[PDB]
Design a protein around this ligand. Structure first.
Ligand SMILES: CC(=O)N[C@@H]1[C@@H](O)[C@H](O)[C@@H](CO)O[C@@H]1O
Ligand SMILES: [Cl-]
Ligand SMILES: [Cl-]
Ligand SMILES: [Cl-]
Ligand SMILES: [Cl-]
Ligand code: NA
Length: 129
């Protein structure tokens, strides 16, 4: 599923991401925009053999199991395919654990490089929330 911008902001807000660990909703929508272009089916292979999955590009090195990342963890206790569903519950729940692990949203490389320090409120501008 390719979410619309305001459609994804609503779903993130319903699942409790707005100001989760102090990150306003616009941060999460910006992160999704540059990680997956709002596409729940996005995948990308990392150089070390791990793979990032879904709308927030969550990495199999630490957070999910895909059966093909030897030595990795499954800290969110989910198959990585659950992160590709049109329902974003799994991605949001796992995002909440990642963002709580000490490093905030710096765990998302695209957020650090393309959202951090910008007007992230622009990303929820005009949305009925
Ligand atoms: C929280 C998380 O899994 N972030 C990943 C990061 O691990 C990975 O290096 C990158 C590759 O582009 O995508 C995402 O930002
Ligand atoms: Cl915001
Ligand atoms: Cl594995
Ligand atoms: Cl959803
Ligand atoms: Cl933080
Ligand atoms: Na894993």
């Amino acid at each position: 599923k390719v979410f619309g911008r305001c459609e994804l902001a609503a779903a993130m807000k319903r699942h409790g991401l707005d100001n989760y660990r102090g990150y306003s909703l616009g941060n999460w929508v910006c992160a999704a925009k540059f990680e997956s272009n709002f596409n729940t089916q996005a995948t990308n292979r990392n150089t070390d053999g791990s793979t990032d999955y879904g709308i927030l590009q969550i990495n199999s090195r630490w957070w999910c199991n895909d059966g093909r990342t030897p030595g990795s963890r499954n800290l969110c206790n989910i198959p990585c395919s659950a992160l590709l569903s049109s329902d974003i519950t799994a991605s949001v729940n796992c995002a909440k654990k990642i963002v709580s692990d000490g490093n905030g949203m710096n765990a998302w490389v695209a957020w650090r490089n393309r959202c951090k320090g910008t007007d992230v409120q622009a990303w929820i501008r005009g949305c009925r929330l």
